[PDB]
């Protein structure tokens, strides 16, 4: 069997309706039950069963979660969505070959928020080992889309840049990003201006944090 979950991603305003669809290649309805499960999964956790047999709430699951459908076509509805509902959702055929759908990442929308940007020079202990990383945190921003560029004395560098983004926060609905420029000690010490530049919706021009190595 093939289970096709759509959309793969959606954003919904706090207190509004989230509608997630799951279509099976064949009917999963017996003469009594429709064998469709819906799960919620948060980062670092096993999946949580929300809906069993298409339309039933597992014990303790809030009323805002609702499932419907029969045969090949199923729908998970969440209304009104809460901040904590920021998660990935899965449908699954709950018998036979127990096929999972591909998942749907739900974003809870919030007001725009500019990133709080902080830059950090290499630590004295990293330098002792002959390496040099410059770190930039871009924290608690919204929306998710963000672009970061590193410049060394005005010359953009991409090699040796490592980027990581958090999942949407479950409580304040923001995103955060970390960008680490790794260089050798010798290159670090050959240049002065080190600049983290961020392009985000909240600003028409790059958000810039900088330090000069010989001012340290």
């Amino acid at each position: 069997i093939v289970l096709t979950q759509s959309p793969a991603s959606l954003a919904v305003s706090l207190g509004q309706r989230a509608t997630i669809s799951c279509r099976a290649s064949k009917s999963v309805s017996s003469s009594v039950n429709s064998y469709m499960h819906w799960y919620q999964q948060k980062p670092g956790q096993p999946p949580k069963l929300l809906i069993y047999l298409a339309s039933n709430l597992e014990s303790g699951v809030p009323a805002r979660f609702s499932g419907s459908g029969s045969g090949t076509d199923f729908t998970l509805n969440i209304h009104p969505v809460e901040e904590e509902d920021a998660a990935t959702y899965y449908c699954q055929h709950s018998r036979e070959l127990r096929t999972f759908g591909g998942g749907t990442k739900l974003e809870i929308k919030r007001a725009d928020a500019a990133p709080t940007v902080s830059i950090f020079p290499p630590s004295s202990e990293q330098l002792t080992s002959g390496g040099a990383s410059v770190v930039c945190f871009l924290n608690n921003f919204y929306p998710k889309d963000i672009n970061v560029k590193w410049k060394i004395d005005g010359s953009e560098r991409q090699n040796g840049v490592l980027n990581s983004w958090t999942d949407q926060d479950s409580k304040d609905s923001t995103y955060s990003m970390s960008s680490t420029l790794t260089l050798t000690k010798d290159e670090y010490e050959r240049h002065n201006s080190y600049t983290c530049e961020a392009t985000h919706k909240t600003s028409t021009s790059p958000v810039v944090k900088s330090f000069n190595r010989n001012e340290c």
Partner: protein, 213 residues
């Protein structure tokens, strides 16, 4: 009440073999099917197979993708024997209580056990303090370790609010992660802020103080 605990996950070489276990309590083990499900990092869940209950002759069934793996049980632990491990097998592995006599299957899941299939060797992290060159952001850079995971707290958990710990990213077979904490200007540098890093795979525990330049 009901409990499921996965164990046996670790770093394993390609072509290698591993057996994972799942420890159960709080219900009549013998009456339940038991399933194994995996999840590659950032990917969808994948059902792997189950072992049937007494009433159905303790027989097993597997997904097309692993029909290579073997499931068994001690009548109260359930096992997953994995052979000829490869890259695609790297995942968190879960056991879940499947069907009994009416209770929902996949309501109860363990915390999972992380399997990493790689030739790269276990390596401890280097931990670097990130100090600035009304509210102040400090951080730690955790660099050069393998495999996952590492955990980071600030002031032994005392600083819980305003923490961001970033997903690890692999580069040339070594992981890097970072964590930031934002504290009132009244706490630092007046008093001390420490990141506490642990890497159980290398038996490393490092506490790095963030001292002003």
């Amino acid at each position: 009440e009901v409990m499921l605990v996965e164990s046996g996950g670790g770093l394993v070489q390609p072509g290698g073999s591993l057996r994972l276990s799942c420890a159960t309590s709080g219900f009549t083990f013998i009456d339940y099917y038991m399933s194994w499900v995996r999840q590659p990092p950032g990917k969808a869940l994948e059902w792997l197979g189950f072992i049937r209950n007494k009433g159905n002759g303790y027989t097993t069934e597997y997904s097309t993708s692993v029909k290579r793996f073997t499931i068994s049980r001690d009548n109260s632990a359930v096992y997953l024997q994995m052979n000829t491990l490869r890259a695609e097998d790297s995942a968190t592995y879960y056991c879940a209580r499947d069907i009994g006599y009416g209770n929902s299957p996949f309501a109860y899941w363990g915390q999972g056990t992380l399997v990493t299939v790689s030739a790269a060797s276990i390596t401890p992290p280097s931990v670097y303090p990130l100090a600035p060159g009304s509210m102040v952001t400090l951080g730690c850079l955790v660099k050069g370790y393998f495999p996952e995971p590492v955990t980071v707290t600030w002031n032994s958990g005392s600083l819980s609010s305003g923490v961001h710990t970033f997903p690890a990213v692999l580069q040339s077979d070594l992981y890097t992660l970072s964590s930031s904490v934002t504290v009132p200007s009244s706490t630092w540098p007046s008093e001390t802020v420490t990141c506490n890093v642990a890497h159980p795979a290398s038996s490393t525990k490092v506490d790095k103080k963030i001292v002003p330049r």
